[PDB]
Amino acid sequence: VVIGIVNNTVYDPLQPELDSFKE
Amino acid sequence: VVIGIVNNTVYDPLQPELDSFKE
């Protein structure tokens, strides 16, 4: 819908912190 | 770098809630 959007990635602080420990 | 800084602790709401359950 937005003119000029770009691809990138957004960091998720929760996922590594709570997947390394929960493993 | 800051003049007047003090020592203290900052509560982490995530750590107890998600380490007691993940144990």
Ligand SMILES: *[C@@H]1O[C@H](CO)[C@@H](O[C@@H]2O[C@H](CO)[C@@H](O)[C@H](O)[C@H]2NC(C)=O)[C@H](O)[C@H]1NC(C)=O
């Ligand atoms: C990155 O951006 C490109 C375009 O800027 C996206 O490419 C489109 O992707 C859809 C779905 O895969 C296709 O139907 C279009 O034909 C693609 N267009 C072009 C110009 O390539 C792409 O989806 C974005 N994301 C990624 C991960 O590549």
Ligand SMILES: *[C@@H]1O[C@H](CO)[C@@H](O[C@@H]2O[C@H](CO)[C@@H](O)[C@H](O)[C@H]2NC(C)=O)[C@H](O)[C@H]1NC(C)=O
């Ligand atoms: C609490 O504050 C004191 C100073 O206000 C800090 O003490 C310094 O600690 C560093 C690293 O351990 C030393 O190199 C300095 O010599 C210490 N200075 C003094 C005046 O003690 C201390 O790091 C802070 N944190 C804790 C947990 O004590």
